[PDB]
Design a protein around this ligand. Structure first.
Ligand SMILES: Cc1cc2nc3c(=O)[nH]c(=O)nc-3n(C[C@H](O)[C@H](O)[C@H](O)COP(=O)(O)OP(=O)(O)OC[C@H]3O[C@@H](n4cnc5c(N)ncnc54)[C@H](O)[C@@H]3O)c2cc1C
Ligand SMILES: Cc1cc2nc3c(=O)[nH]c(=O)nc-3n(C[C@H](O)[C@H](O)[C@H](O)COP(=O)(O)OP(=O)(O)OC[C@H]3O[C@@H](n4cnc5c(N)ncnc54)[C@H](O)[C@@H]3O)c2cc1C
Lengths: 533, 538
């Protein structure tokens, strides 16, 4: 394959110049080698519009990255930067623009700094969560990671997509926990953000913004730069871990549950991941047994797509809670037991029929073997593959911390989803509180062996996106298939936001070589052809 | 006055067009009117380089701001946007480029939204901390502000300068607590950031980044747009407040104090402002400020005054301090939460400090069940710790506030290095030591005050000296995070990695978002293309 508008002779010269920088054994051109850069969960799998690489280049150093950018810029070669390329559900290892050369940074896997007393690290993009966890545990570090689940991927690459994990509130937002970056620009120049812009700065990983415009955010969900280094704020290993279960009896309890849980979260009574499920509706939380392990009354309810309210009588008869809220607490035993006691007192005052249980308690540190037995190792910053040890994408619109909105998005998107026949499984989609102050409402897409089905799945998802936007519910992260679809919903001021990103794109990357099309941002030379329809 | 390179007729056409938008009574041109737009604390006070304004326009609405921008862009009129203009120590109400038309947003004082249950607001730039606190207190709100001290100024204006306050760690960084913005660009278009870019978005003040590049940061310490609206995350009023004192006997205790305090902070044992001071050296503290305010001055020990008089070094106060039995260091930890929670947190902090410092002493300094009555609020040690904007410390200046790591060895190295360059020059350093200020988690600010004089010659000396201190700090990897227009180009010059890649990057964005270069020319050392060579730093 060739990059569109790039003749074969120009491409071959570009590739020879890359090989001269990184070595011929680190420039990949074969159909066999490039199959490994296909999106394993492509919603366009096997179709004309499938996103494919023209080639891949795997540099060893930031200096080589600079030289590859220089060469790409000169020859106008489109470059798609990945860190470890494990972005399954959101585009995998494939480019946003078919024909782009993948710049694969997986060899730049150096741990630049770990500071135990100040609880930070600085990492290259190739440092995986597994690499960093092994490094910290072998050093008997008292620092935790915040890891996705499962724990494949890169601290950098995950942060560049604004990914998430499951430890304390201040670390669950990976990009928000970063401090300082190094960026290579389209012209090959290298730039440090924040305090790192001062040579010999002592504070690159300690003070986020630096001096003047705070620019780090423009590189995330973006195509304005190649990130070569990133600092992260790390969570000290707490003294102890307490998970408490709150059980509520009524469907209608959701509205005051959301209000009270959000107040306690905002009051920092707990900093762990709040997990809400419905035992009555059989929805799962982080209980691992679910996949690992059938009342006729329940099965009939589930068969006829019963609404949530229809489970309340059944739940009440079986003595099953309608809602469980699991609160996680990190800190000294006496402290987290007092936080949990306060949480119970507030819930008992609001819900006189509320029941409570201590679900987990650990004094830290754990042994490797005790760690293997915790309900959800990601809550301890342990990257792991257990969750699915006994293809897809998702629409994950963000809603407020409001129970009325939890009900409205179910009522609104559940029906449009039923009309157009996406198989929603439970009575209800229960809101996910990944980050403080909002929820995500998670709808899976399943890849079919039939491209005609995949086409209808893409048309249905694009409808669900427009319906959600009409009710003020917007997506926060998506696969290339839907990136321009979602950016079109952010249309305030006649698409002011996209027109703004296009201005910065043209300033920082005038030749438009960096990850064309990423988050709906096309460089000026491709913008006419790739205007959203 | 005319804006430089603009003729009387063009200026008159622009002024007339502004008055057609905001009305004739809200366009100001007289010397007398414009005197209020001078920097009350100008380090150039009365001198030729003093930052002056050529006119001021005070619009009522964001739609009037759009039309003002359109007109200024049409006539290449340089515009300097202020919210309430209370930026004393950092430029006051004055532009970064003399002859700029001040765009004064003080009339845009609407509280767009307050949500008690989700603990947020959306405000216009004219909403002062005093206005907002009054609004919340009359409503008997269970939400707190994070306020500077003194509490004059604008939630938006202070946030746009990346200012700081004194409540819980997650609100003390005012820009970091913001969620969503509305910006008018140089061409007069309006844009909403984050989730507000979706018309009818329900999440503008709930989910910070929105979708695609997270751009809000580029408008802070910048000249890329005019901020017309901002969301803030607000702190729920906690159940209770507890402040504990840790007393340590030795100078050398600083290094492990910083280590242990930083670990407990990063472990969220406490979330309040940790206050470190030296009773022994008499360094300022929230506690010493309350005393000076309550009982006025106190008769100083002449043994203390002998040490202070001869500019004795910190180590020389240790024997004196152990004689009069006064601590060398006091660390005040502030806890917000349920009484049983904060008492347990303080108990845990005491156990940790007792194991690290077997000689440590402890006291509970302050405890309150919230809410406070108006009478208790009057009598707390430091009202800004309760989100109360106040004027107690009003009963001029600029600063060099370099940022250092949470490292005791750096705290000593910055004292030895700058507490001699300053001694070699004539800058008055009062105490034996500048004690680091933990404004935000994971760093310290090292505060050297510049005192503005009636003597212009002494203000020129002060400028030259501070420009030196900025270069010496830079050579030791200590960078300034905020400064007055006098020093903005000087500080931007220190961030020179990659042959000034950061400034050349900002200049590229400047030219894409403001090609005619009308927004706040020179702010944080960012000059538009047409002025860049003439104003190139030296
Ligand atoms: C079952 C399942 C569960 C998942 N759970 C989670 C979860 O808990 N949390 C979560 O966040 N994700 C989750 N994911 C999504 C995904 O697996 C992770 O986000 C993964 O960590 C991302 O891949 P990566 O770290 O290798 O990043 P990469 O794929 O290397 O990077 C992601 C994207 O960012 C850009 N990028 C990467 N590196 C750079 C760079 N150096 N400079 C500029 N741009 C760059 C590129 O466009 C790239 O495609 C899940 C997926 C599946 C299928
Ligand atoms: C004794 C003393 C103590 C102080 N203590 C503190 C303190 O504790 N914490 C603290 O943070 N500061 C402190 N300051 C500094 C200052 O008083 C405050 O930061 C003050 O709140 C800022 O002024 P303001 O809110 O009116 O902002 P403004 O002056 O309105 O805005 C600040 C700057 O931001 C830009 N700007 C403003 N509005 C906009 C807009 N809408 N769009 C684009 N750009 C805009 C302008 O360049 C403006 O000059 C102190 C000063 C003194 C003298």
């Amino acid at each position: 394959m060739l990059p569109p508008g790039i003749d074969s002779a120009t491409f071959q010269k570009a590739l020879s110049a890359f090989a001269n920088v990184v070595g011929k054994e680190w420039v990949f051109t074969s159909d066999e080698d490039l199959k490994l850069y296909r999106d394993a969960y492509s919603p366009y799998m096997g179709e004309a519009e499938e996103r494919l690489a023209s080639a891949a280049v795997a540099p060893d150093t930031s200096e080589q990255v600079q030289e590859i950018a220089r060469i790409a810029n000169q020859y106008s070669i489109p470059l798609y930067t990945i860190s470890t390329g494990k972005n399954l559900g959101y585009g995998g290892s494939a480019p946003t623009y078919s024909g782009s050369v993948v710049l694969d940074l997986k060899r730049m896997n150096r741990i630049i700094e770990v500071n135990e007393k100040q609880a930070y690290c600085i990492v290259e993009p190739g440092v995986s969560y597994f690499d960093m966890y092994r490094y910290l545990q072998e050093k008997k570090s008292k620092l935790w990671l915040d890891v996705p689940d499962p724990g494949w991927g890169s601290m950098v690459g995950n942060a560049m997509d604004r990914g998430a994990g499951y430890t304390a509130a201040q670390f669950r937002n990976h990009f928000d926990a970063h401090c300082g970056m190094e960026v290579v620009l389209a012209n090959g120049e290298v730039m440090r953000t924040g305090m790192g812009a001062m040579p010999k700065s002592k504070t690159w990983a300690m003070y986020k913004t630096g001096f003047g415009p705070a620019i780090d955010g423009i590189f995330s969900q973006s195509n304005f730069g190649i990130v070569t280094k990133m600092g992260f704020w790390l969570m000290p290993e707490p003294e102890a871990f307490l998970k408490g279960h709150i059980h509520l009896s009524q469907y209608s309890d959701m509205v005051p549950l959301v209000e009270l849980m959000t107040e306690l979260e905002n009051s920092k009574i707990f900093t762990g991941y709040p997990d809400i499920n419905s035992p009555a509706m059989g929805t799962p939380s982080l209980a691992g047994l679910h996949e690992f392990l059938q009342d006729p009354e329940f099965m009939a309810l589930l068969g006829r797509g019963a609404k949530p309210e229809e489970y309340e009588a059944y739940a009440k008869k079986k003595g099953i809670p309608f809602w469980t809220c699991a609160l996680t607490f990190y800190g000294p035993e006496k402290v987290i037991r007092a936080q949990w006691e306060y949480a119970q007192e507030r819930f008992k005052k609001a819900f006189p029929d509320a029941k409570f249980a201590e679900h987990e308690f650990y004094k830290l540190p754990l042994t490797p073997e005790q760690a293997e037995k915790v309900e959800y190792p990601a809550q301890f910053g342990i990257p792991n593959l257990r969750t699915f040890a006994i293809g897809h994408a998702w629409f994950s619109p963000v809603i407020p911390r409001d129970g009325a909105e939890v009900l409205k998005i179910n009522e609104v998107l559940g029906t449009e989803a039923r009309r157009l026949g996406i198989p929603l499984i439970f009575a209800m989609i229960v809101p996910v509180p990944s980050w403080e102050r909002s929820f995500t409402f998670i709808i899976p897409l399943f890849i079919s062996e039939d491209p005609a089905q995949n086409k209808r799945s893409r048309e249905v998802f694009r409808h669900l996106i427009k319906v959600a936007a009409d009710n003020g519910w917007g997506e926060y992260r998506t696969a290339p298939t839907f990136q321009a679809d979602v950016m079109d919903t952010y249309s305030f001021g006649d698409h002011a936001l996209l027109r703004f990103h296009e201005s910065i794109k043209d300033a920082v990357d005038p030749k438009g070589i960096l990850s064309p099309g990423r988050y709906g941002i096309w460089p000026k030379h491709l913008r006419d052809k790739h205007r959203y329809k």
